[PDB]
Design a binder for this molecule. Sequence first.
Ligand SMILES: Nc1nc2c(ncn2[C@H]2C[C@H](O)[C@@H](COP(=O)(O)NP(=O)(O)OP(=O)(O)O)O2)c(=O)[nH]1
Ligand SMILES: [K+]
Ligand SMILES: [Mg+2]
Ligand SMILES: [Mg+2]
Ligand SMILES: [Mg+2]
Length: 331
Amino acid sequence: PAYACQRPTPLTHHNTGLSEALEILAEAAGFEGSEGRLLTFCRAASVLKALPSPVTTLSQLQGLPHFGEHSSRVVQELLEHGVCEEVERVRRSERYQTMKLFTQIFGVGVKTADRWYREGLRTLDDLREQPQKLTQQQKAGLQHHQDLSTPVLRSDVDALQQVVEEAVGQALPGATVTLTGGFRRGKLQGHDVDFLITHPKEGQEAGLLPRVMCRLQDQGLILYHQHQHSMDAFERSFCIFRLPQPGSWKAVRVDLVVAPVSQFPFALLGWTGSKLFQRELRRFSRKEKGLWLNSHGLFDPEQKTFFQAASEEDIFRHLGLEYLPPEQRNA
DNA sequence: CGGCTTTACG
DNA sequence: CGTA
DNA sequence: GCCG
Ligand SMILES: Nc1nc2c(ncn2[C@H]2C[C@H](O)[C@@H](COP(=O)(O)NP(=O)(O)OP(=O)(O)O)O2)c(=O)[nH]1
Ligand SMILES: [K+]
Ligand SMILES: [Mg+2]
Ligand SMILES: [Mg+2]
Ligand SMILES: [Mg+2]
């Protein structure tokens, strides 16, 4: 199928080297402001992730969506020689390495990274030498960069889920906490931990994060937090937690999002990802079904009505798609 | 060409 | 501009 | 970069 939401995409697969190479080119395209090329290379990579066995010959690419001349050439060289010269050229280029370093800082996007690169900056120390030019978010991302570069593990997730569950339960009787993001899709490692919070009585979830954050801050667990007030915007908090470790601690990015229970299935679907799965699903909804999907709902612009969903299964059914559990959304 | 997910908040 |  |  042409859309990633039409096919199961497991976390581990049979074309790891080929997908890795295409995702290098996708990332590099993004660094150069070519978001169309990034999307195609990402889609091509995801098609290989969905295949039931390894690609060993070029003919297997015939008929595969999103494989044109460029993506096919990359696979051809990897099959024939074990490397793709274009990919290796990107890997060792100063532009790619610096843009990857900068864009992985919390608070730095492609545009900021590119400006810093054009200004001649190249290292984290170059950034630190002019703290007056950094936002508070970027200061926090640099302050904690080493820890934030360290993979978050399942044991960290379990520990953070307990402290968030404890704080949410202290802030609002009856509130629930659901692990979302990459760990819900079965990832064993990740860049952060994402939690979705709700309450079974519509409206009772309002005003929750300030209470949650105060209780976390009084335990000394919050190194950074950025709160966004709240339906078409959820209350959200992008945090850096201080996570205890044997004899020490490490900083961990944690995202908290609160949804009213009426919108919980849409929030869970959106925050579970993957990012490409989400994009593909929303593209499918609009272009194939004429319905507008976001993290709050599913809108019929002809009838001018929102679909009330009680589950992710409801949403897949309303879109005419076979249900995919989170572990098969690893597009 | 025209499109490419989503979009309020800080 | 940045954040999911 | 690929699709229509
Ligand atoms: N609308 C929108 N949703 C996004 C975007 N990026 C991600 N999402 C959605 C889809 C994402 O799955 C979800 C959580 O975002 P992460 O925590 O940044 N990523 P994940 O947990 O998958 O992996 P890891 O943390 O290990 O890097 O938010 C975006 O630019 N826009
Ligand atoms: K970043
Ligand atoms: Mg173009
Ligand atoms: Mg995450
Ligand atoms: Mg996150």
